[PDB]
Amino acid sequence: TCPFYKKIPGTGFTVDAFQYGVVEGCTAYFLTHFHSDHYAGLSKHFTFPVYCSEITGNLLKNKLHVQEQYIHPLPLDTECIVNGVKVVLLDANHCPGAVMILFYLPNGTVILHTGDFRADPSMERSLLADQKVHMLYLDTTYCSPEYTFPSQQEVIRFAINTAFEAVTLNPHALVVCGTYSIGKEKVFLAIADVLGSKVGMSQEKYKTLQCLNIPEINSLITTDMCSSLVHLLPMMQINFKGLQSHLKKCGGKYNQILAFRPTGWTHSNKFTRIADVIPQTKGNISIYGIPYSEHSSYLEMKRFVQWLKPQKIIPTVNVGTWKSRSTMEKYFREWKLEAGY
Ligand SMILES: CC(=O)Nc1ccccc1O
Ligand code: NI
């Protein structure tokens, strides 16, 4: 059965609710982004209207094989009427195609659903600037002050500089980057750009990237592994065994691997700085874990919410334990009381 925090009251709408069968009363199913925990249940035999971004629509059609008649793409930053209700989609600063949804209810209530997002000050000058928001459905992934990590720009600077140094010292080094979903494409794109190379990958991953409306994409990626000195592999293969195996397949072209595992937050963030990060090394293989986040830090989340000043907050992540629920509710009260409300 579909939980309360995935339903929008006073409407026939649900958000990211595809794993519960036919939801009684739902006339339109919104999908915030193409990550598996959110699309769970969608498949080629789905027969209800799905509302989403153009990029998400491309992935539904080509990867999940949802029929074209049921896919309803909407432009960003544009007032649209859906089943008699005004809605707006806003960029979520998450993965490609990810959106937040503003719902203008018939009774005068205004609801913002963030989907998954990485809060940014630029959101303070979107269409959010105008009007009051009564209810906020919030991505609370990292809602605790221990969750710190650098800017995406800082992390990419580290990756580019590390890769360029290694390959300039040894022109026979291969660079490998792990992936298991869409998002974080800047990691491999920025490294390949500094090395003067296209990014090589499987047919399956190439298909996925071809759905994302990235400018000049044909100039940046390839299925010809031999032509490329930056390769993408499934995240599960980014370990000494998997990388040794991959090096064997390259036909004596390379004699060293430098690999990157983009993660979210890890406990090594509580001790180390990005500048001081070191790899795990065995022989001619080195692996860097880099903290490239597509979710808000605690401080980014706090700033956004204190600016928006919602009357009510409904968390959408870490909802399963009493301890998590109590901790989040305490921070929301601090933030409110502190802002002067
Ligand atoms: C806690 C709540 O419901 N809302 C709120 C309102 C103003 C500032 C911060 C806040 O968190
Ligand atoms: Ni996500």
Which domain CATH number covers 40?
3.60.15.10
Beta carbons of 297 and 144 less than 8 angstroms apart: no
Residue 210 and residue 126 share a domain: no
User: Hey, CA dihedral for 211, 214, 216, 219, is it positive or negative?
Assistant: negative
Q: Which residues contact 262 (CB under 8 A, 6 or more apart)?
A: 177, 178, 184, 187, 290, 292
Give CA 67 to chain center in angstroms: 25
Give the closest residue to 258 by CA, choosing from 172, 183, 152, 136: 172
Q: Pick from 146, 151, 137, 136: which is nearest to 294 by CA?
A: 151
Q: Answer positive or negative: Cα dihedral of 38, 264, 142, 183.
A: negative
By CB atoms closer than 10 A (0-12, 13-18, 19+), residue 318 is: middle
Q: For CA atoms 245, 246, 251, 252, give the dihedral sign.
A: negative
Pairing of strands 80-82, 85-91: antiparallel
What residues contact residue 277 under an 8 Å CB cut-off, 6+ apart?
158, 268, 288, 289, 290
Q: Which ligand is nearest to the CA of 306?
A: 1
Say which residues have a Cβ less than 8 Å from residue 143's Cβ, sequence separation at least 6. Answer: 298, 301, 315, 317, 318, 327, 328, 331
Residue whose C-alpha is closest to residue 16's, from 32, 35, 34:
32
State the Cα–Cα distance between residues 92 and 117, nearest whole angstrom: 5
119 C-alpha vs ligand 2 centroid, how far in Å?
Answer: 14
Residue type, 66: V
d(CA 114, CA 333): 20
Are residues 281 and 325 located together in one domain of the fold? no
- Cβ 174 vs Cβ 252: under 8 Å: no
Nearest ligand atom owner, CA of 183: 2
CATH of residue 181's domain is 3.40.50.12650
Q: Which domain holds residue 287?
A: 148-295
User: Rounded distance, CA 206 to CA 200, Å?
Assistant: 9
- Ligand 1 touching residue 307 (CB < 6 A): no
Let me know whether 14 and 51 are in one domain.
yes
Distances (CA, A) of 161 to 122, 166, 275: 28, 9, 11
How far away, in angstroms, is 182 Cα from ligand 2 center? 9
Centre of ligand 2 to C-alpha 298, Å, is 17
Neighbouring C-beta atoms of residue 205, cutoff 10 Å: 18
Q: Are residues 210 and 331 in the same domain?
A: no
User: Residue 137: CB within 6 Å of ligand 1?
Assistant: no
Q: Does the beta carbon of 207 lie inside 6 Å of ligand 1? A: no
Q: What angle do CA 224, 225, 230 make, to 5 degrees?
A: 120
Residue 32 CA to residue 17 CA, distance in Å, equals 10
Q: Which residues pair with 323 in a beta bridge?
A: none
**Data resolution in angstroms:** 1.4
State whether 319 and 269 are in the same domain: no
Single out the residue of 88, 143, 146 nearest to residue 305, CA to CA: 143
Contact in structure between 146 and 299 (CB atoms under 8 Å): no
Contact 94, 33 (CB under 8 A): yes
**Residue 332 near ligand 1, beta carbon < 6 Å:** yes
Q: Which residues contact 192 (CB under 8 A, 6 or more apart)?
A: 198, 199, 220, 228, 230
Residues near 93 by beta carbon (within 8 Å), at least 6 away in sequence: 117, 118, 119, 120, 122, 123, 294
How was this model experimentally determined?
X-ray
Nearest to 28 by CA among 80, 64, 75: 80
Percent helix, strand, coil in the chain, to 5, is 35, 20, 45
Total domains in the chain come to 2
In this structure, the answer to whether residues 172 and 280 fall within a common structural domain is yes
Give nearest CA residue, ligand 1 atom 3: 312
Q: Are residues 71 and 153 in the same domain?
A: no
Contact 39, 64 (CB under 8 A): yes
Residue 313 CB less than 6 A away from ligand 1: yes
CB 241 within 8 A of CB 124: no
74-79 long-range contacts (CB < 8 A, ≥24 apart) are 77/126, 77/127
> Per residue, what are the HEC states of 297-331?
CHHHHHHHHHHHCCCEEEECCCCCCHHHHHHHHHH
101 φ/ψ angles, rounded to the nearest 5 degrees: -125, 125
Distance CA 238, CA 179 (A): 9
Q: Are residues 19 and 74 in the same domain?
A: yes
Taking the centre of ligand 2 as the mean of its atom positions, its distance from the CA of residue 224, in whole angstroms, is 30
Same domain, 176 and 241: yes
∠ CA 288-289-295, nearest 5°, is 145
Question: How many Å lie between the centroid of ligand 1 and the Cα of residue 102?
Answer: 18
* Tokens read off for 174: 């291969």
Residue 234's Cβ-side half-sphere holds a number of Cα atoms within 13 Å equal to 6
